[PDB]
Amino acid sequence: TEFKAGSAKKGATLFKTRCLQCHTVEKGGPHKVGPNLHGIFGRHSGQAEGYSYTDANIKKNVLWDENNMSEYLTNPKKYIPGTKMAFGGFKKEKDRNDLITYLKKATE
Ligand code: HEC
């Protein structure tokens, strides 16, 4: 719709430098500050096992699809008030395009 693929290698690195601190993407990868992100697309928020998500994340019951992840990536707190995710966001659409590209390939 409003989602455009960019670079997976670029996105791989945005992840490492901006998301790796609190999340893993691999299947069998563990939860850390953040929950493991394997299989997140198609998935609704707050459903990873062994993970304690805020009341905020839970009740948002957001269906993770690439378009959705873009709004969130711009301003998670604005997008999900009450969330403990400590990420200020991606204001540049290319950044978001590029990371979603990566996530879409890495989390499947
Ligand atoms: C790099 C920009 C990041 C991406 C992609 C994601 N995050 Fe995080 N994140 C953090 C916490 C503590 C939570 C849980 C929130 C709560 O329980 O209130 C999250 C949550 C997410 C989610 C939603 C997960 C779901 O199953 O619904 C996604 C898609 C997500 N995060 C992607 C913490 C952190 C964090 C620690 C300081 C960082 C750097 C990031 N998150 C960055 C990213």
UniProtKB/Swiss-Prot annotation:
SUPFAM superfamilies the record matches: Cytochrome c (SSF46626)
Chief place where the protein resides: mitochondrion
A Pfam family it matches: Cytochrom_C
Subcellular location: Mitochondrion intermembrane space
Annotated InterPro entries: Cyt_c-like_dom, Cyt_c-like_dom_sf, Cyt_c_1A/1B
Induction: By oxygen at the level of transcription. Expression drops rapidly when the oxygen concentration falls below 0.5 uM O(2).
GO molecular function terms attached to this record: cardiolipin binding; electron transfer activity; heme binding; metal ion binding
PTM entry text: Methylation may enhance its transport into mitochondria. Methylation occurs in fungi, plants, and some protozoa, but not in animals. The precise role of methylation at Lys-78 is unknown, but it seems to preclude pro-apoptotic activity, possibly by lowering affinity for APAF1.
UniProt key word Heme: yes
Chain positions with N6,N6,N6-trimethyllysine modification: 77-78
Swiss-Prot/TrEMBL GO biological process terms: mitochondrial electron transport, cytochrome c to oxygen; mitochondrial electron transport, ubiquinol to cytochrome c
Keywords for this protein: Electron transport, Heme, Iron, Metal-binding, Methylation, Mitochondrion, Respiratory chain, Transport
Details of cofactor binding: Binds 1 heme c group covalently per subunit.
Residues annotated as binding heme c: 19, 22-23, 85
One annotated Gene Ontology cellular component of this protein: mitochondrion
Cofactor: heme c
Family: Belongs to the cytochrome c family.
Function: Electron carrier protein. The oxidized form of the cytochrome c heme group can accept an electron from the heme group of the cytochrome c1 subunit of ubiquinol-cytochrome c oxidoreductase. Cytochrome c then transfers this electron to the dinuclear copper A center (CU(A)) of the COX2 subunit of cytochrome oxidase, the final protein carrier in the mitochondrial electron-transport chain. Isoform 1 (CYC1) is the predominant cytochrome c during aerobic/normoxic growth.
Other notes: Present with 7330 molecules/cell in log phase SD medium.
Protein name: Cytochrome c isoform 1
Taxonomic source organism: Saccharomyces cerevisiae (strain ATCC 204508 / S288c)
Name of the coding gene: CYC1
